RNA sequence: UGAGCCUUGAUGGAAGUGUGGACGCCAGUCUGCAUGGCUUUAAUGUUUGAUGUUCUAACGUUGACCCGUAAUCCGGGUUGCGGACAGUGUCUGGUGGGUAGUUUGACUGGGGCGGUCU
RNA sequence: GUUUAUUAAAAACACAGCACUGUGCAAACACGAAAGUGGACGUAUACGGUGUGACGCCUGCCCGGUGCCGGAAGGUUAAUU
RNA sequence: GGGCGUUAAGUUGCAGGGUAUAGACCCGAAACCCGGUGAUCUAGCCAUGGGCAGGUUGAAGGUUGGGUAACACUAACUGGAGGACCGAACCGACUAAUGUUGAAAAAUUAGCGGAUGACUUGUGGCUGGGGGUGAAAGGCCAAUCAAACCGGGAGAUAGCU
RNA sequence: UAAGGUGAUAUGAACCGUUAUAACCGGCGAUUUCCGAAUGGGGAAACCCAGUGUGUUUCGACACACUAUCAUUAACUGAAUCCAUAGGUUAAUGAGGCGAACCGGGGGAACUGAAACAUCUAAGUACCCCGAGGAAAAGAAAUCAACCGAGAUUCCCCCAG
């Protein structure tokens, strides 16, 4: 639902089988929290994968300079 | 896999490693409160000035901190009874305070962060040995004793 | 304890007496040490895979207490217990009907049952 | 004893008894987005779930089939490299 | 040699015959799907209040007198049980007649069962449709229930009348 | 603008007007109870209750006026913890709700057809949700071409069923 840093997902899709299922699929990603900011100290964001790995090449700061600004 | 300790701590590096280091280990412990590291362009070049500019410390500073084992050795017996009782045991707590605080029983003061004793001290009353460890370059010697009341 | 590079060895300071490991078509040679005047393969460096040792430093805490707060959430702080474990991400061997992908003919004295389709 | 009020009162449901299994208490489990509540103001001689079958006398033989419980040495076997 | 061609005038309108894509002559299902409205009936349950002349019988236990070495045993009095009795209110519906274009879309009349209990009732609250509730009949969920009502997909489809 | 005129179902009464502030029409205003985004709090809509200020005051009062919530900024206050934040107060701006269709976007059927039915169709239609405008939306090559070259996006007819 979140993965804040990055968008998210929760888009639907149909999970076909052998030929076809007109069913539906959805909810993905995950969560976690408690991220230590070099500054004061951690607010627990509920990012997920692709969000967690993002806080790496990036920052922790710029990775937050948005969930604030905007 | 890229950091700069400088304040070596059992890690395969001193004065900060410039080649492949550990990863995910510093994200929560090393970097926080411990020894910050980021071996990324910016922080890198800034360390060169701390080294390319390089000592009077080994001759002078070492001396303003080496007299430790010499200033405190002939000391009068430490008489801080740790509530010896319980049919042959004690009541008083022996850990960090009574070891170092045993010096201001007349005035002088120290820092509880210099003690040298791996194991905690058994709550006895005998010749409590205290190997004062001010700095790596220089070590000292102290004692402690318990009485009945 | 395996294996890769490959580093130092055995095939392809001047005599004699000796000690050890080597293997045999076997009657033998190999090979360090005192006194005497490239590959087949072994050790050390290593790189890396295995078990097993120990360490703290991962972060965990659905323990306690303090504020926000006349909240059971959450966050911060103190404290305790756990601790580089757990757990997560990528990769990888298992296992995996738990799930999925792979319609059910016609003829016929209605149809179906039966029978037949060359 | 109970049941198809209004075509079935039974050999069906229940029953006491038996067994398996789960639950260390903020119990398992259930109602509930949560708070909270039931279980229980009980705490393994207790509570739940499954199957077998008031009180009395009892409840025989079969584990081949299916299911479940234990083992897991060996065979077969997924992703993965 | 044989197949197909080779001194067949076509083309563009207009009106018509046919064909193609379209509804598709008209009316009609039982149904499926989507979104809302419904627990003012009824089924359960929650909270808070009320009712039971109505009347009867009268077990176990006990108090006391008697009595026993002690009990049993007994006599009264108290006591108050029971798929107990008849029994009004109240609750329910076993039987027959009448009604059947009714007084009434389930009742009236005479009987009938329970009536201190798994009782009965007022007020308000909570469960929503493949869902609820159910001492279980597929019963009840507003005269509707083997899947409610309302609106929509919708002119569903109808080789049938 | 003007001789009439006081809206309609019915006059009638009592009247206003004929010159140029009587009507009547058009513009800008003034007023504009209660409810309704409803905004001081509550509420079964048009009702109920308060705080803090006010004027006239025969100086209790009447009514009036302000006081919702969010967001931006401003200043002031300000925890666990020195700091700093969290939080709090005040104030100025602004939003909030209606709205027919067209438009961008998030979510998205089934009947139906395939003479059955799963791929496929219906159709990204129905519908539901958000948003904005007068239109919206789109709009200067890491485009295409084929060794020739074209030259941003958009909309129209062809290429082609
Ligand atoms: Mg459906
Ligand atoms: Mg009563
Ligand atoms: Mg009843
Ligand atoms: Mg009579
Ligand atoms: Mg029953
Ligand atoms: Mg029942
Ligand atoms: Mg029925
Ligand atoms: Mg007002
Ligand atoms: Mg409000
Ligand atoms: Mg066809
Ligand atoms: Mg269609």
UniProtKB/Swiss-Prot annotation, chain A:
Q: What superkingdom heads the lineage?
A: Bacteria
Post-translational modification N6-acetyllysine, affected residues: 8
- What do the Gene Ontology cellular component annotations say? cytoplasm; cytosol; cytosolic large ribosomal subunit
Q: What is this protein called?
A: Large ribosomal subunit protein bL31
Underlying gene: rpmE
**InterPro entries xrefs:** Ribosomal_bL28/bL31-like_sf, Ribosomal_bL31, Ribosomal_bL31_A, Ribosomal_bL31_sf
GO MF annotations, alphabetized: rRNA binding; structural constituent of ribosome; zinc ion binding
Q: How would you summarize the oligomeric state and partners of this protein?
A: Part of the 50S ribosomal subunit.
UniProt family annotation:
Belongs to the bacterial ribosomal protein bL31 family. Type A subfamily.
Cofactor stoichiometry and binding?
Binds 1 zinc ion per subunit. Only 1 ligand appears to be Cys, the other are thought to be His and either backbone amides or solvent.
Q: How is it modified after translation?
A: Proteolytically cleaved by protease VII to yield a peptide lacking residues 63-70. It is not clear if this is due to protein degradation or is a bona fide processing event in the strain used in PubMed:339950 and PubMed:10556732. In strains B, D10, MRE-600 and Q13 the only protein seen in PubMed:10556732 was full-length; the last 7 amino acids were sequenced only for strain MRE-600.
Q: Which cofactor does it need?
A: Zn(2+)
| UniProt xrefs under Pfam families | Ribosomal_L31
A GO biological process of this protein is:
negative regulation of cytoplasmic translational initiation
**Key words of the record:** Acetylation, Metal-binding, Ribonucleoprotein, Ribosomal protein, RNA-binding, rRNA-binding, Zinc
The record's function comment reads: Binds the 23S rRNA.
Q: Where does Zn(2+) bind?
A: 16
From Swiss-Prot, chain B:
Pfam families on file = Ribosomal_L9_C, Ribosomal_L9_N
Q: Give the domain of life.
A: Bacteria
Positions of modified residues (N6-acetyllysine) = 89
Checking PROSITE patterns in the record gives: RIBOSOMAL_L9
User: Which GO molecular function entries does the Swiss-Prot or TrEMBL record give?
Assistant: large ribosomal subunit rRNA binding; structural constituent of ribosome
* Gene3D superfamilies from the UniProt entry: Ribosomal protein L9, C-terminal domain, Ribosomal protein L9, N-terminal domain
- Keyword Phosphoprotein recorded: no
GO:BP terms for this protein? Answer: cytoplasmic translation
User: What's an example GO cellular component term for this entry?
Assistant: cytosol
Q: How does it assemble?
A: Part of the 50S ribosomal subunit. In stalled/collided disomes (pairs of ribosomes where the leading ribosome is stalled and a second ribosome has collided with it) bL9 in the collided ribosome contacts bS6 and uL2, while it contacts only helices of the 16S rRNA in the stalled ribosome; the inter-ribosome bridge thus formed is different from that formed between normally translating ribosomes.
Q: Which PANTHER family match?
A: 50S RIBOSOMAL PROTEIN L9
Q: What's the protein called, per UniProt?
A: Large ribosomal subunit protein bL9
Q: Source gene?
A: rplI
